[PDB]
Motif scaffolding. Sequence first.
Motif, PDB file in Angstrom:
ATOM      1  N   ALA A 175       0.828  -1.198   0.000  1.00 59.63           N
ATOM      2  CA  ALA A 175       0.000   0.000   0.000  1.00 59.63           C
ATOM      3  C   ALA A 175       0.873   1.263   0.000  1.00 59.63           C
ATOM      4  N   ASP A 176       0.277   2.390  -0.441  1.00 56.82           N
ATOM      5  CA  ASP A 176       0.931   3.695  -0.384  1.00 56.82           C
ATOM      6  C   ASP A 176       0.632   4.204   1.049  1.00 56.82           C
ATOM      7  N   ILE A 177       1.675   4.616   1.786  1.00 56.61           N
ATOM      8  CA  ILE A 177       1.488   5.136   3.149  1.00 56.61           C
ATOM      9  C   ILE A 177       0.541   6.339   3.177  1.00 56.61           C
ATOM     10  N   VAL A 178       0.552   7.187   2.128  1.00 54.86           N
ATOM     11  CA  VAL A 178      -0.332   8.368   2.101  1.00 54.86           C
ATOM     12  C   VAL A 178      -1.789   7.964   2.062  1.00 54.86           C
ATOM     13  N   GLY A 181      11.219  14.709  -1.852  1.00 59.59           N
ATOM     14  CA  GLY A 181      10.885  13.613  -2.749  1.00 59.59           C
ATOM     15  C   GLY A 181      10.529  12.369  -1.979  1.00 59.59           C
ATOM     16  N   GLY A 182      10.222  11.306  -2.737  1.00 59.54           N
ATOM     17  CA  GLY A 182       9.888  10.007  -2.162  1.00 59.54           C
ATOM     18  C   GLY A 182       8.773  10.048  -1.149  1.00 59.54           C
ATOM     19  N   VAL A 183       8.908   9.226  -0.063  1.00 58.21           N
ATOM     20  CA  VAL A 183       7.890   9.147   0.978  1.00 58.21           C
ATOM     21  C   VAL A 183       7.634  10.497   1.668  1.00 58.21           C
ATOM     22  N   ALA A 184       8.712  11.210   2.043  1.00 59.72           N
ATOM     23  CA  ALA A 184       8.563  12.471   2.752  1.00 59.72           C
ATOM     24  C   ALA A 184       7.896  13.521   1.866  1.00 59.72           C
ATOM     25  N   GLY A 185       8.279  13.564   0.582  1.00 60.66           N
ATOM     26  CA  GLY A 185       7.628  14.507  -0.334  1.00 60.66           C
ATOM     27  C   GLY A 185       6.160  14.224  -0.514  1.00 60.66           C
ATOM     28  N   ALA A 186       5.783  12.931  -0.584  1.00 68.18           N
ATOM     29  CA  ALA A 186       4.392  12.514  -0.729  1.00 68.18           C
ATOM     30  C   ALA A 186       3.545  12.826   0.499  1.00 68.18           C
ATOM     31  N   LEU A 187       4.084  12.588   1.704  1.00 69.62           N
ATOM     32  CA  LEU A 187       3.330  12.952   2.916  1.00 69.62           C
ATOM     33  C   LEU A 187       3.163  14.504   3.020  1.00 69.62           C
ATOM     34  N   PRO A 229       6.673   3.498   7.051  1.00 69.75           N
ATOM     35  CA  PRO A 229       7.320   2.919   5.877  1.00 69.75           C
ATOM     36  C   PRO A 229       8.518   2.040   6.314  1.00 69.75           C
ATOM     37  N   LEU A 230       9.109   1.309   5.362  1.00 67.35           N
ATOM     38  CA  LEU A 230      10.285   0.466   5.628  1.00 67.35           C
ATOM     39  C   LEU A 230      11.518   1.364   5.659  1.00 67.35           C
ATOM     40  N   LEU A 231      12.054   1.643   6.869  1.00 70.19           N
ATOM     41  CA  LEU A 231      13.134   2.621   6.968  1.00 70.19           C
ATOM     42  C   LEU A 231      14.336   2.307   6.147  1.00 70.19           C
ATOM     43  N   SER A 232      14.955   3.371   5.581  1.00 70.09           N
ATOM     44  CA  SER A 232      16.203   3.293   4.827  1.00 70.09           C
ATOM     45  C   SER A 232      16.134   2.473   3.538  1.00 70.09           C
ATOM     46  N   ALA A 233      14.939   2.029   3.104  1.00 64.87           N
ATOM     47  CA  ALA A 233      14.825   1.304   1.842  1.00 64.87           C
ATOM     48  C   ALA A 233      14.715   2.340   0.667  1.00 64.87           C
ATOM     49  N   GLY A 234      14.438   1.883  -0.566  1.00 63.52           N
ATOM     50  CA  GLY A 234      14.352   2.780  -1.710  1.00 63.52           C
ATOM     51  C   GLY A 234      15.695   3.428  -1.940  1.00 63.52           C
ATOM     52  N   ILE A 235      15.674   4.715  -2.210  1.00 67.19           N
ATOM     53  CA  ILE A 235      16.901   5.441  -2.536  1.00 67.19           C
ATOM     54  C   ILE A 235      17.819   5.714  -1.353  1.00 67.19           C
ATOM     55  N   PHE A 236      17.435   5.355  -0.109  1.00 65.51           N
ATOM     56  CA  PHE A 236      18.405   5.398   1.000  1.00 65.51           C
ATOM     57  C   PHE A 236      19.376   4.213   0.949  1.00 65.51           C
ATOM     58  N   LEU A 271       3.290  -1.717   8.732  1.00 67.13           N
ATOM     59  CA  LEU A 271       4.205  -1.292   7.655  1.00 67.13           C
ATOM     60  C   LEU A 271       3.464  -1.248   6.315  1.00 67.13           C
ATOM     61  N   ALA A 272       3.510  -0.100   5.668  1.00 72.18           N
ATOM     62  CA  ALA A 272       2.966   0.033   4.315  1.00 72.18           C
ATOM     63  C   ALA A 272       4.105   0.106   3.311  1.00 72.18           C
ATOM     64  N   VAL A 273       4.140  -0.858   2.361  1.00 73.23           N
ATOM     65  CA  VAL A 273       5.228  -0.910   1.381  1.00 73.23           C
ATOM     66  C   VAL A 273       4.579  -0.785   0.013  1.00 73.23           C
ATOM     67  N   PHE A 274       4.837   0.322  -0.668  1.00 74.59           N
ATOM     68  CA  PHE A 274       4.156   0.615  -1.930  1.00 74.59           C
ATOM     69  C   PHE A 274       4.836  -0.025  -3.174  1.00 74.59           C
ATOM     70  N   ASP A 275       4.859  -1.348  -3.200  1.00 72.09           N
ATOM     71  CA  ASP A 275       5.440  -2.083  -4.326  1.00 72.09           C
ATOM     72  C   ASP A 275       5.105  -3.542  -4.102  1.00 72.09           C
TER      73      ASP A 275
HETATM   74  C1  LIG Z   1      10.781   0.648  -0.900  1.00 69.30           C
HETATM   75  C2  LIG Z   1       9.730   1.575  -1.491  1.00 69.30           C
HETATM   76  C3  LIG Z   1       8.638   0.758  -2.247  1.00 69.30           C
HETATM   77  C4  LIG Z   1       9.097   2.482  -0.418  1.00 69.30           C
HETATM   78  N1  LIG Z   1       8.081   3.319  -1.053  1.00 69.30           N
HETATM   79  C5  LIG Z   1       6.962   3.765  -0.459  1.00 69.30           C
HETATM   80  N2  LIG Z   1       6.482   3.075   0.602  1.00 69.30           N
HETATM   81  C6  LIG Z   1       5.292   3.433   1.084  1.00 69.30           C
HETATM   82  N3  LIG Z   1       4.463   4.382   0.657  1.00 69.30           N
HETATM   83  C7  LIG Z   1       4.981   5.086  -0.375  1.00 69.30           C
HETATM   84  N4  LIG Z   1       4.373   6.141  -1.026  1.00 69.30           N
HETATM   85  C8  LIG Z   1       5.213   6.567  -2.046  1.00 69.30           C
HETATM   86  C9  LIG Z   1       4.850   7.624  -3.007  1.00 69.30           C
HETATM   87  C10 LIG Z   1       5.875   8.063  -3.892  1.00 69.30           C
HETATM   88  C11 LIG Z   1       5.601   9.022  -4.801  1.00 69.30           C
HETATM   89  N5  LIG Z   1       4.368   9.597  -4.890  1.00 69.30           N
HETATM   90  C12 LIG Z   1       4.070  10.503  -6.003  1.00 69.30           C
HETATM   91  C13 LIG Z   1       3.327   9.268  -4.020  1.00 69.30           C
HETATM   92  O1  LIG Z   1       2.262   9.882  -4.096  1.00 69.30           O
HETATM   93  C14 LIG Z   1       3.627   8.238  -3.044  1.00 69.30           C
HETATM   94  C15 LIG Z   1       6.366   5.811  -2.027  1.00 69.30           C
HETATM   95  C16 LIG Z   1       6.218   4.848  -0.983  1.00 69.30           C
HETATM   96  C17 LIG Z   1      10.130   3.299   0.344  1.00 69.30           C
HETATM   97  C18 LIG Z   1      10.418   3.036   1.683  1.00 69.30           C
HETATM   98  C19 LIG Z   1      11.321   3.816   2.387  1.00 69.30           C
HETATM   99  C20 LIG Z   1      12.001   4.874   1.793  1.00 69.30           C
HETATM  100  C21 LIG Z   1      11.706   5.138   0.445  1.00 69.30           C
HETATM  101  C22 LIG Z   1      10.804   4.354  -0.274  1.00 69.30           C
HETATM  102  S1  LIG Z   1      12.404   6.494  -0.370  1.00 69.30           S
HETATM  103  O2  LIG Z   1      12.982   6.044  -1.614  1.00 69.30           O
HETATM  104  O3  LIG Z   1      11.366   7.495  -0.441  1.00 69.30           O
HETATM  105  C23 LIG Z   1      13.714   7.033   0.673  1.00 69.30           C
HETATM  106  C24 LIG Z   1      13.256   7.043   2.125  1.00 69.30           C
HETATM  107  C25 LIG Z   1      13.031   5.625   2.608  1.00 69.30           C
END
Ligand SMILES: CC(C)[C@H](Nc1ncnc2[nH]c(-c3ccn(C)c(=O)c3)cc12)c1ccc2c(c1)S(=O)(=O)CCC2
Length: 169
Positions: free
Chosen positions: A20-23, A46-52, A124-131, A152-156
């Motif tokens: 799911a998307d955390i937002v 950007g990413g999670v913080a930008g979306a929230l 969200p899953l800390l430090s994943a994605g671009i971290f 935990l919500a993981v959007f993938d």
């Molecule tokens: C692993 C990944 C699937 C996960 N992503 C996410 N996990 C949960 N809810 C999410 N919402 C969005 C999203 C992103 C763009 N927009 C436009 C939205 O509206 C909504 C992303 C997303 C994730 C977990 C942690 C971190 C990141 C990414 S990061 O790359 O932002 C760096 C900080 C740590």
Amino acid sequence: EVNSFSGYLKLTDNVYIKNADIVEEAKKVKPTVVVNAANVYLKHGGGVAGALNKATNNAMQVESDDYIATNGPLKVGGSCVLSGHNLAKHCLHVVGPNVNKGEDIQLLKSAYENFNQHEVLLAPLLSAGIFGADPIHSLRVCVDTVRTNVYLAVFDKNLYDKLVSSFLE
Ligand SMILES: CC(C)[C@H](Nc1ncnc2[nH]c(-c3ccn(C)c(=O)c3)cc12)c1ccc2c(c1)S(=O)(=O)CCC2
């Protein structure tokens, strides 16, 4: 209804997970606490913080800038409690290490430890994605560290399936 989490898979007595998307989760659930995957200056670019932040129509960024002006930046592995705005009662801004920028993966335990000051969290899953942290390692640290109730919500879907497969080995 309070903390209306739906469709999660229970991994341990205190850790649940959803594709799911955390937002979107924060809008539906209205949790007591939503965790932001922040940086030390609380710049939600950007990413999670930008979306929230975008879901709060930038109210989170203005509040964050005022917090940093008075208190200074956070440390890697640290956190602060700010308003949840329309997404939650509170937002817990947590800084996990950014391994792609040379920060120490061992700080991921300190980052998850911040969760234990709150009874229920959407995170969200800390430090994943671009971290850059290995997402299967980040889930293992979460399960071993968090003692309060964490959703935990993981959007993938692809990553979700790999994380559930890994936990169930
Ligand atoms: C692993 C990944 C699937 C996960 N992503 C996410 N996990 C949960 N809810 C999410 N919402 C969005 C999203 C992103 C763009 N927009 C436009 C939205 O509206 C909504 C992303 C997303 C994730 C977990 C942690 C971190 C990141 C990414 S990061 O790359 O932002 C760096 C900080 C740590």
